[PDB]
């Protein structure tokens, strides 16, 4: 049941992907650590909530 994932390697030694291993010891998900394998979304629902889609090169009002 081991989970193996990639580390995003910052400062490299003078020493190819580096991995780390994770095993969950408990039945309840709440006991689990934070994965940090998170997603990003587009800001549109906040930055552009207008009914008619905007084209930046075009006049906002027309």
């Amino acid at each position: 049941g081991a989970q193996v994932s990639s580390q995003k390697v910052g400062a490299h030694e003078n020493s190819s992907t580096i991995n780390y291993t994770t095993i969950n010891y408990y039945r309840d998900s709440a006991s689990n650590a934070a994965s940090k394998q998170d997603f990003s979304q587009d800001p549109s629902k906040f930055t552009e909530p207008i009914k008619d889609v905007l084209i930046k090169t075009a006049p906002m009002l027309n």
């Binding site: 039945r27 906040f46 930055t47 006049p59």
Partner: protein, 235 residues
């Protein structure tokens, strides 16, 4: 049992650690999520939303609705600044409390491009051309249109499109700037000028306000999470 050997770090509590721990309520029937509108995945999404700048923090206008209004008038052309602003998004008093400034105060380092949008709130009968400038750091801060002209700038013509956006491009020596006032990581100067002048007809208000907004461009990021000075608890 298995021969083990304790390393340094044993029994410490790092508040930034990431470990499993026993659940105090086993087999608890969790309420499922529903699809609530407005989910956020990253704090930078909020920094990309335009927020209004308290430009006029003068002794009588600060902490009132008035601090947000930059007054203009139909007066003869001058080469003197309408407003002057240091590009210090987390520490300059006019930027530090904007949504961008507030998120920046939870982090030690910022990087990326910013954009300033101005809204003309005068009558439709009012016309005018303004110059919005950005001078990268290292010379005399611009106090006259002639020096501001020489840096990054937009000449805004007032008309049906009410608003104008100047992008402040990421121009830095360091890969990241600090969220405090520091000369080594200074960002430069924003200043606004009259290119021609505001012209109104008769029976029209000769004075009007412009409002300004700041937000981050998609190349903007922050790092090294820290505590803010913008909230506290004496006792």
């Amino acid at each position: 049992g298995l021969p083990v050997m304790n390393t340094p770090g044993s029994n410490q509590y790092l508040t930034a650690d990431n470990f499993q721990s026993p659940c105090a309520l086993p087999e608890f029937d969790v309420t499922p999520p529903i699809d609530i509108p407005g989910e956020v995945k990253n704090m930078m999404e909020l920094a990309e939303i335009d927020t209004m700048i308290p430009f006029d923090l003068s002794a009588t206008k600060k902490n009132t609705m008035e601090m947000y209004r930059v007054r203009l008038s139909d007066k003869p052309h001058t080469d003197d600044p309408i407003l002057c602003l240091s590009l210090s998004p987390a520490s300059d008093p006019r930027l530090s409390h904007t949504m961008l400034g507030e998120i920046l105060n939870y982090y030690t380092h910022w990087a990326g491009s910013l954009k300033f949008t101005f809204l003309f709130c005068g009558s439709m009968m009012a016309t005018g051309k303004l110059l919005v400038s950005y001078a990268p750091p290292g010379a005399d801060p611009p106090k006259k249109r002639k020096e501001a002209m020489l840096g990054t700038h937009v000449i805004w013509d007032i008309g049906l499109q009410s608003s104008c956006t100047m992008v402040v491009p990421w121009i830095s020596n360091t890969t990241y700037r600090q969220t405090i006032d520091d000369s080594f990581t200074e960002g430069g100067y924003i200043s606004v000028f009259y290119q021609t002048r505001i012209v109104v007809p008769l029976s029209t208000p000769r004075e009007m306000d412009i409002l300004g907004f700041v937000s981050a461009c998609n190349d903007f990021s922050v790092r090294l999470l820290r505590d803010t000075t913008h909230i506290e608890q004496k006792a």
